[PDB]
Amino acid sequence: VEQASDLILDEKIKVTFDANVAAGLPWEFVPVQRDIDVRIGETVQIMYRAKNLASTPTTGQATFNVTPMAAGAYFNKVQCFCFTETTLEPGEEMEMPVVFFVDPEIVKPVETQGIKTLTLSYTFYPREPSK
Template sequence: MTEARKQPAEERRHRNNRVIAAVCLAFFGGMIGMAYAAVPLYQLFCQVTGYGGTTQRVDQYSDRVLDQEITVRFDANTTGGLPWEFRPEQRHISMPIGETVQVAYFAKNNSTRPTRGRASFNVAPAMAGAYFNKVECFCFTDQELKPGGSLDMPVIFYIDPDIVNVPELKNVKTITLSYTFFPLNEDKPVAASSNKDASADSNIGG
């Protein structure tokens, strides 16, 4: 009887241990999955809500224009030692709320080698990002400029008329759209390219 009772008890204990181990593994795997998903989910949250000054991406122009103007200022920056001149073609515009407008930013590579960059952006005040609708934009697209090369980059946007219904924003008269270009890593280091060219010249001379 003792052995008979002891064996089921051990089986139950082993079974319970397996269940606990499975739960722990599932929890650990879930935490890893959440960590990998955190960044894209946060970006999606920002795009949907405009949180942190993230603008909205739309596919069509505004169909409603208010008899009320707002001023949009344009800001441009570079970071990470990117050797570019980067600026808006105009510093600000005054526009009817809901009107679709086009502006442009200008970039020029002041270095003697090809360089690549990508722009991030934000809107101030941050809450206005949910009502800043961009139809066309160069943001988050890799841009490559040859030595001395330049590029005009259009931005087509409008301010959602619903912005006047938001108590915190109804008295906002100015919105700032800011872009920052940062460098992208080159496919191959300049030193490696120079060594390769020197090796080729050596082989030709031999």
């Protein structure tokens, strides 16, 4: 429950935040690190930041693949929507904290049964008017 010390068993499980960007979002979408580890539950704060480098406002509405393959379900980002890139005016600095961990429920089902490097492949590529 945006904390996990019932479930923080020892697996220092590595995670690989695959941030990507293309024309469609002309924003300096910085990952904080490529990757982290969490003790399967360890609520770590990882920010994200986006400077809008269009010379016009853009939207953002960026697609992802929230999984290495099997898992994704077990990707404990915060719920309630809040990846708010949405829209920015030309020069505006979006930044937000995310708090994150891997669910140790990953080490339960046949689905995963071996999967342990979580990744979210984020693709900032919706639409620019012109940068």
